Amino acid sequence: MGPVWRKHYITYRINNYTPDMNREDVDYAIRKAFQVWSNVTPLKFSKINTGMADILVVFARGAHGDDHAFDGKGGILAHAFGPGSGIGGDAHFDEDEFWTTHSGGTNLFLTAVHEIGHSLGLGHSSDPKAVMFPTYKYVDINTFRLSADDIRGIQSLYG
Numbered sequence: 001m002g003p004v005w006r007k008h009y010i011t012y013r014i015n016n017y018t019p020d021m022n023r024e025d026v027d028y029a030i031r032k033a034f035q036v037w038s039n040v041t042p043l044k045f046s047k048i049n050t051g052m053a054d055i056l057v058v059f060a061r062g063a064h065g066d067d068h069a070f071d072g073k074g075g076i077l078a079h080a081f082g083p084g085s086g087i088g089g090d091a092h093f094d095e096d097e098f099w100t101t102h103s104g105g106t107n108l109f110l111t112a113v114h115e116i117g118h119s120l121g122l123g124h125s126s127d128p129k130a131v132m133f134p135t136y137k138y139v140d141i142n143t144f145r146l147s148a149d150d151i152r153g154i155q156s157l158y159g
């Protein structure tokens with residue numbers, strides 16, 4: 001196994017909000033993202049408004065404090081760090097993208113599910129149906145199901 005959280009109670013905090021979407025939409029998209037993984041694991045995710053949280057959600061552009069700079073609109077949409085203290089577990093989203101709640105631009109919910117998967121310690125899949133497939137794909141939020149590979153992967157880490 002790579003790094004895994006050694007606790008089932010995992011907190012998260014949204015450090016800043018993208019101006020592309022309204023604030024509640026970002027809150028909703030992120031909350032549903034964690035719930036996707038919560039549905040198939042013994043993991044419980046709780047939101048923190050102020051203070052220390054395991055998983056920090058950040059919207060930034062270009063070079064932004066870590067050794068992994070973003071590249072403007074297109075290309076890399078986001079990245080996340082594996083489980084661990086400090087920057088570990090944190091998920092950063094490229095602000096040069098246009099985040100949406102739909103098919104247009106880049107869907108935040110889908111990207112968040114993928115990144116949180118990284119935050120939980122998952123690698124990539126070669127299954128085009130898997131959410132941990134390396135490249136983005138849009139699918140209606142309610143024709144959406146976790147692939148068997150995603151579920152097998154995450155259950156091998158927790159439970």
Ligand SMILES: CCN1/C(=C/C/C=C\C=C2/N(CCCCC(=O)NCCCOCCOCCOCCCNC(=O)[C@H](CCC(=O)O)NC(=O)[C@H](CCC(=O)O)NC(=O)[C@H](Cc3cc(-c4ccc(-c5cccc(Cl)c5)cc4)no3)CP(=O)(O)c3ccc(Br)cc3)c3ccc4c(S(=O)(=O)O)cc(S(=O)(=O)O)cc4c3C2(C)C)C(C)(C)c2c1ccc1c(S(=O)(=O)O)cc(S(=O)(=O)O)cc21
Pocket residue numbers: 068073074075076077078079080110111112114115118128129130131132133134135136137138139143144145146147148149
């Ligand atoms: C309407 C519709 N429809 C339909 C539908 C259906 C649906 C569904 C189904 C299903 N499912 C679900 C899921 C899956 C599905 C599928 O498959 N789908 C497919 C689709 C396809 O489409 C096509 C098109 O495409 C497009 C795409 O585009 C996009 C692009 C982009 N990309 C890129 O490239 C980017 C950029 C962009 C710009 O430029 O801007 N980039 C990227 O991405 C990067 C890369 C770069 C490089 O590398 O260089 N990357 C990044 O960014 C990263 C981050 C991220 C990621 C992400 C993501 C990922 C992934 C994803 C996904 C995928 C897939 C899926 C999903 Cl859900 C998700 C997402 C996202 N984000 O972000 C970076 P990173 O990684 O972080 C990194 C960083 C740094 C470093 Br140093 C490292 C790293 C399903 C499922 C499942 C299943 C199964 S299982 O077992 O598996 O569970 C099974 C089955 S079976 O059958 O076999 O049993 C199944 C399944 C499933 C199904 C299939 C069911 C239909 C219904 C079909 C229809 C429709 C419509 C219509 C119709 C008709 S009509 O006539 O009307 O027309 C008809 C019909 S019939 O048939 O009835 O006839 C139908 C229909």
Ligand SMILES: [Ca+2]
Pocket residue numbers: 070071072073074075076077078094096097
């Ligand atoms: Ca980019």
Ligand SMILES: [Ca+2]
Pocket residue numbers: 053054055056084085086087088089090
């Ligand atoms: Ca962290």
Ligand SMILES: [Ca+2]
Pocket residue numbers: 018019020094095096097098099
């Ligand atoms: Ca933006």
Ligand SMILES: [Zn+2]
Pocket residue numbers: 064066068079092
């Ligand atoms: Zn970053």
Ligand SMILES: [Zn+2]
Pocket residue numbers: 114118124132133134
């Ligand atoms: Zn990935």
